Amino acid sequence: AGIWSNLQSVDTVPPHWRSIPYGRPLPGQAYRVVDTHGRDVPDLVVGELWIGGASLARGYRNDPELSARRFVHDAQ
Amino acid sequence: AQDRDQPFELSSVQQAYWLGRGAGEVLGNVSCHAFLEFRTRDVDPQRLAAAAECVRQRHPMLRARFLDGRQQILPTPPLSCFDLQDWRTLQVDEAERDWQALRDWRAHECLAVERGQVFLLGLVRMPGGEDRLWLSLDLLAADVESLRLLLAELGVAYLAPERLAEPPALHFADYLAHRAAQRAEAAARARDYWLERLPRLPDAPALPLACAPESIRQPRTRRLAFQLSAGESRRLERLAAQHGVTLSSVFGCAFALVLARWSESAEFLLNVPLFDRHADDPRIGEVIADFTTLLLLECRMQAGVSFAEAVKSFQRNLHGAIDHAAFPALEVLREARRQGQPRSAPVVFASNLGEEGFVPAAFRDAFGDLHDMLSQTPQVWLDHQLYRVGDGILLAWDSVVGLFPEGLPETMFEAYVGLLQRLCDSAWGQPADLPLPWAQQARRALLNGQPACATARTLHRDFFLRAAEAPDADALLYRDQRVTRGELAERALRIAGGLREAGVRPGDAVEVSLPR
Amino acid sequence: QARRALLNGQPACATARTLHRDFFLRAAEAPDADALLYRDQRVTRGELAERALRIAGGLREAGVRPGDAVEVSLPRGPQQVAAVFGVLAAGACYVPLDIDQPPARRRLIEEAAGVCLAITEEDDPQALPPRLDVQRLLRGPALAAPVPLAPQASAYVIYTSGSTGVPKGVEVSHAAAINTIDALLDLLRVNASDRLLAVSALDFDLSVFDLFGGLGAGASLVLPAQEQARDAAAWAEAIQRHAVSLWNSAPALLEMALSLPASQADYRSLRAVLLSGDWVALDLPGRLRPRCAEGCRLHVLGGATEAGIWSNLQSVDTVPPHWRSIPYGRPLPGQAYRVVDTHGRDVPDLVVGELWIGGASLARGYRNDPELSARRFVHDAQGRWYRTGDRGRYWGDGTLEFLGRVDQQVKVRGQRIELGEVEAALCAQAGVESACAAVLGGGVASLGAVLVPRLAPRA
Amino acid sequence: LPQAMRPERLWCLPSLPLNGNGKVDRRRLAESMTRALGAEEPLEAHEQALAECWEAVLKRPVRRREASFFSLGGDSLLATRLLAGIRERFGVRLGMADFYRQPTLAGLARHLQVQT
């Protein structure tokens, strides 16, 4: 993501947190939570986190192949 | 004779829900009863009282006592079979609010099966001239198809006890002494298949939880309900036939797609009750007893396939695991626990989709079609059932309150209904893939939409301007010494010139290996 | 994509409910209040509610039941309104086939809608849909309240034109209709002082706003009669007499209304205006601003029936000069626009592509054509989309310019024709009021075009 | 924490190790615990009493204080025969709430000790 993709401000902790969550995705960037098939999973449904948008690093430098596994492209 | 009055063993799945009364059992502490609420206008409580205790005296299974993991039948139980609440005496809104107290209690109730009370009819006669004829049946006594047999017998016993055709004589214990031992070769022959798969069976459907399933002392079931129209039903049925698949396979496939989409895993166990009739007596479709066997359907729900593929696939998986169902889901999950792997199917797909109407015609005529219902199935987070209602279809999701996040089974069901009529209203060569519930995806498009505040520039551009603006301003402080912006900038630009001198040029890479 | 996700992401205004609910609330709240105004007589919410529920109990007596479906083929008036509310309050889905429509087109739909009853002036149980008199249905028992429906069930099947050869039934759920309506009610603040004008034929879904928008807000649906189906003078009288505040139409019908001089046709009661379903001429707000009330508030709205009554709103106070059509504005709350290429990938801004409409306003599909529904509706990682075949493009501010259709924007023995630029350039002739163009039959497959003069009325 | 989320072996530190890029060093932690890894008869009267009960339920040799009811014959039906046998053996109100969080014979012996 470069340095980050979220800002959960924490003025105070509400009692329903079980960990401090990733907040709203930062300006210019985004998250999806996704199935093994990459289709986005519903709210509260646990899935893999994908980061997107204008904060993404390019890839793993001299490794293009891990970059094609760990970075993916969708209509989104 | 495993004689009609002797104590006899619980049939497989009867053990499962019997143990589901255990207060420490996983999401236990509850009956496994269906509660039905009908509405009708004005119906004789004396006919109803007489009908309830008629069908108890006609059908030994409705007067079965349950103790010690076995069933022993009371010739007549100590406890009354009809809860008449003749509230034509009350005012209407008091009767409604007090009906809510009775409703919640009776519909969540652990029925007194130790005292022969598997079956409990009742009636609140609401002073609005509405007889809320209702029916708590512990499914310990009966298969849900056998619950529509109870309704068939009750409808006749209310209308005309003269028309009650026969005492259906094959005793349920004699059927178990038959059918369980008859299937026992197929139980072992399937136990092989299951045993050899116990590591390779999927998990429980990994839906989201606001309480883990052992960690609530009473699963208060909440029903969620949708009557698919007669026309939506027709479109599902035409498409079901056009794809060569049973309507139950369609609703099952669709449910498995929803559950998949809401699970952490697209592969999981869900339980299917099979309302078995393979004993040779034609009255086995007439005895009011728990002929269910429970099937552990290991469904596996790919993305990207059309729904037509996903349902043909789900049907093969259902029809194939039906062969293996002669070893019961109960004993498979015990076998997984004996292998030290705590698998379960804590979600159920009960497709009561015989063609006649779920409430049989006699009972529909006597009172009304089903108005509301609840299933108190233990160890089950989400008891999804289906019922023909009119020539339409009721989709029931008997969720558990508080187990799920609040609004989740509502949302996940509104997405299930949306899918099932996306299956009415668009041909199944469409992707099996659901939409998200749009309100969720719209929220997420806002989150992901937040504008790039990026004044997009090379990463140093600010600093070399901040340096030109205030060269003396402090940029770095160290153990005592400090570097001004101008100093850091001039130092960095000397290094930069040193790097062009060293043959480094833009976008080529430079290790930096310096103490802080 | 960030900008477009913000727009498509705007959340639902949906009080997600059975489409008819709020009228039955407004009726239980004020039975005395004006539901409708008509030829001379007026109808109160109490009258309409009981009339509709008598029709509904007549319909359950006629075996119509949750999400079974009913042709509605009546003269415009309180009998038509009470009929659709009575179908909806039977929990059934209404199939409006406005009686001006020829029996030829109707007969295609009589089977294709799966339409198991018809409402008409007429009892004829031997008709293909067994056919029922609205008045004998009004002699039915009242359902004391509307039949219960969850909102995802079918609400109406508006039928697309006979231009298709075999008509298609756009089956819209209550959820889809009411998301659209709510999402617009909140922008219009529709209230007890409001009075809509149903210049809408019933087989066109602006009527679905006129109905459940107006009457759900308790605002009064002013009715032209059937013999007033294009009578702009009766509409002008109706606006002036029954004090219409919320005009709603295809723009040709407001051009029909504005054809009448202000002295003859006082529109100064119009508090806000909804325009839809065909191209707004850019100048139309420019013409309308003096004719309607102060705070004129034109809204131009977009999208097919397959995305409810509309899917967009552009507010207009005045035209910013660079508009070449009045754009679809933002997508409406709870529903979205992708612009796609032919290959279903989203196009970048200012690139023309097909418009895909998404989210909480979509139709169920086609009433008995699941097979064509799978072409005209699609499913992606981004969920469900109605494929409009309209052509359009985003702008840098996310405004969605409208640019005709996949039909019309076609090749003719060579280069792609912008027939909207043929219209615009013929409208750039002085003395033209409107212009139009097409591509023709025969082996030559020729282009064709059409002019219309402006007359400038005088004494 | 239920059974599969027990730390089935456990460890502790004065302070957790930190990875180069500032994290808790879950790499080093997992691998240290990994290197720090590298049944017996009934002795207690409660272990013998459980072996009398469990064996009479299971029909198979409970020669072991580390016997596990789950792997021996874990069924909740058989837990009723066990519950009845121990309810007779000590007059205690045993149930699955107590038993299935403590499902090995030496773990369950602790419940017989408290006579409740």
Ligand SMILES: Nc1ncnc2c1ncn2[C@@H]1O[C@H](COP(=O)(O)O)[C@@H](O)[C@H]1O
């Ligand atoms: N404001 C508008 N301007 C131009 N075309 C429109 C407008 N509103 C709707 N349409 C489109 O043109 C057709 C008219 O809508 P419909 O009759 O609902 O199918 C559909 O293809 C619409 O998406």
Ligand SMILES: *P(=O)(O)OCC(C)(C)[C@@H](O)C(=O)NCCC(=O)NCCS
């Ligand atoms: P026990 O070992 O006899 O039962 C334990 C169990 C794992 C089978 C049980 O806790 C469980 O998960 N029951 C599921 C019951 C069920 O799905 N019933 C549906 C009835 S149609």
